[PDB]
Design an enzyme around this catalytic site. Structure first.
Site, mmCIF file in Angstrom:
data_model
loop_
_atom_site.group_PDB
_atom_site.id
_atom_site.type_symbol
_atom_site.label_atom_id
_atom_site.label_comp_id
_atom_site.label_asym_id
_atom_site.label_seq_id
_atom_site.Cartn_x
_atom_site.Cartn_y
_atom_site.Cartn_z
ATOM 1 N N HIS A 17 1.259 -1.243 -0.372
ATOM 2 C CA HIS A 17 -0.164 0.384 0.198
ATOM 3 C C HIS A 17 0.709 1.066 -0.332
ATOM 4 C CE1 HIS A 17 -3.810 -2.322 1.535
ATOM 5 N NE2 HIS A 17 -2.908 -3.430 1.536
ATOM 6 N N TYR A 138 -8.147 38.982 -7.440
ATOM 7 C CA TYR A 138 -9.474 38.313 -8.315
ATOM 8 C C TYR A 138 -9.429 39.534 -9.885
ATOM 9 C CZ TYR A 138 -14.083 36.928 -9.784
ATOM 10 O OH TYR A 138 -15.284 36.412 -10.227
ATOM 11 N N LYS A 142 -9.052 37.421 -13.739
ATOM 12 C CA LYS A 142 -10.236 37.888 -14.204
ATOM 13 C C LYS A 142 -9.610 38.053 -16.309
ATOM 14 C CE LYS A 142 -14.761 39.442 -15.333
ATOM 15 N NZ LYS A 142 -15.911 41.147 -14.335
#
Lengths: 194, 194
Positions: A17, A138, A142
């Site tokens: 694992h 932001y 954008k």
């Protein structure tokens, strides 16, 4: 009993694992624990904040959000981590100041064949936005998205993992930095500090 | 006030906020609601189980795990959904028998440019395993992963979304069906039924 091998020491074994930093003969779900013990000293698991950890072995990326416990002592890779009943459940792998990852089956995960692509990890600033391979304010993001929106998407060449205090995201980009795919995990986390 | 437009009715607007089935003038975080109303009837949000919803507009895939309320009435796409204080927060979008999605900012989300790729959604049978584009019993899958291990990975051509009642996963495959990348979310969910 159960064996735990550290990838940092050459312990990766593709027939065992695999979790960030560990190959083990068992697959423990470490989400349930709230207290662990290292050398007979108890430590609390942090609530609602995790650690994004990864190992890169062969050409394989093994990344996941893991629980972490708070410990002022310095611990080293391979130190056994136990439950309160005396069973070894993990080994020390990654640290962020006084936070130590508890590696095993954790929360959101990313497994990836690294053949032909790269992968990069970023601390996402609170309040920032993401496009492709960058973060910024932001309104700036954008615009960057608008400059890129016209282009034709080339093939994925890079993965970018964005680890923030409220959200984590994974983006893929082409050669230009154009965003191909974005995925968001709604959990807060930190990145290890080497 | 806040406007909500249904993608099923031609309402997609790339300059508005985008969620599964909805373009809106606002971006509501719908995780915080435990109860909603539709037409003066109150409905409870299901705890710890969600709906994976997506809309595909232009070449843009907009998918996310959304909260979901239990309602024995038949509701129609576009029916306004309010909170219990009289504010409209969403519109009806997707349904799974008596479960109705609450679209907005939800839990784990996948945004993808569908240029040159496909995306497929599957109900993951409890106890099954996944390799690439197929699910089956753990034993059959482990054989498949071993036959496929030798292949050299190529570029991704298809995405596969596996929605289970304890875990959700996204896998990707190349032209030979080799699994390139996998992401897992530790949340249970259902898919909409058309």
């Amino acid at each position: 009993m159960a064996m735990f091998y550290a990838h940092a020491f050459g312990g990766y074994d593709e027939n065992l694992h695999a979790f960030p930093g560990i190959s083990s003969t068992v697959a423990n779900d470490v989400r349930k624990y709230s207290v662990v013990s290292v050398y007979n000293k108890k430590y609390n698991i942090v609530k609602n904040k995790y650690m994004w950890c990864n190992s890169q072995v062969n050409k394989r990326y093994i990344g996941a959000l893991l629980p972490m416990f708070e410990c002022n002592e310095y611990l080293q890779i391979g130190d056994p981590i136990h439950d309160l009943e005396g069973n070894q459940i993990s080994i020390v792998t990654y640290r962020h100041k006084n936070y130590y990852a508890l590696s095993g089956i954790g929360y959101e995960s990313l497994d990836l064949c690294l053949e032909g692509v790269g992968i990069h990890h970023h601390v996402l600033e609170t309040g920032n936005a993401v496009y492709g391979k960058v973060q910024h304010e932001y309104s700036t993001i954008k615009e960057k998205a608008k400059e890129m929106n016209a282009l034709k998407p080339g093939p994925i060449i890079d993965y970018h993992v964005w680890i923030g205090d409220c959200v984590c995201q994974v983006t893929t980009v082409d050669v230009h930095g154009k965003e191909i795919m974005r995925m968001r995990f709604k959990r807060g986390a930190v990145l290890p500090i080497p």
